[PDB]
Amino acid sequence: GPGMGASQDDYALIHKNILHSEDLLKYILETSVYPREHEQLKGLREVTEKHEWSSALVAADEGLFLSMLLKLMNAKRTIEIGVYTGYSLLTTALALPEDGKITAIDVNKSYFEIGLPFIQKAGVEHKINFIESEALPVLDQMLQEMKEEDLYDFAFVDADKPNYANYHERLVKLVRVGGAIVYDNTLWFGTVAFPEYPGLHPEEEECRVSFRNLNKLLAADPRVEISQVSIGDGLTICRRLY
């Protein structure tokens, strides 16, 4: 409608955690994450923590885990769907080798412009091709243009959660055999464990439903092998088998 959309202040889940206690998550961040966090990632996180959609920001411990995965698999060409202010994007660009290439897709370039100065200061702007667009049309055009030699090593999916199953049908063809697709937020604040969950915002309830469907679909999908990981808000790593 012409009015203002829902704000995260209208959401019921934003103060929820999947870990046992706030103290345990704080321990992980202070002990194992902040001492290992790039100065420009720390700056980007601190600005984003103030932003109207801060609850969408990828967790910082999850960021270091994505970095580790990219380095262990020697990824060099990646795609990111859902950029926001650029925390996972800057994480990825810092992790890739100097000639690494990232295709980054978001509908909102104004969000990306918040993180862009941090990306520039980190020296990794040259690795990023930012596409201001809804992701599905971009992915569908890639299916017509891209050749086998151009396939992606790694995909991070963190945009509009109800569309994940649709993204999957494209990305399992756009990531190479043996490549990885990582879907963020697949435990959705712990709500996926319940067939009914009271008092959610309609937009939060739509994601509870879509993630329960997606988690079943990925578990049954013979094109990939999976690992669901209780880090951050949950993520699911998919490895393409054929």
Residues making contact with a copy of itself (CB under 8 A): 17-21, 23-28, 31-33, 35-36, 61, 64-65, 67-69, 71-74, 178, 180, 187, 190, 192-194, 215-216, 218-220, 225-231, 236-237, 239
Residue whose CB is less far from ligand SAH, 82 or 179: 82
Structure tokens at 81: 């769907």
The single residue among 84, 154, 164, 188 that binds ligand SAH, judged by CB under 6 A, is 84
Please give the Cα distance from 55 to 7 (Å, whole number): 11
The single residue among 40, 67, 78, 88 that binds ligand SAH, judged by CB under 6 A, is 88
The piece of 8-16, 165-173, 176-184, 222-230 that touches Mg ion (CB under 5 A) is: 176-184
Strand duo 224-229 + 235-240: pairing? antiparallel
Residue whose CB is less far from ligand SAH, 156 or 197: 156
| Neighbouring C-beta atoms of residue 26, cutoff 10 Å | 11
Interface with ligand SAH includes 56 (CB under 6 A)? yes
Interface with Mg ion includes 153 (CB under 5 A)? no
| Neighbouring C-beta atoms of residue 137, cutoff 10 Å | 11
Please give the Cα distance from 200 to 206 (Å, whole number): 9
Closest CA to 15 of 215, 194, 190: 190
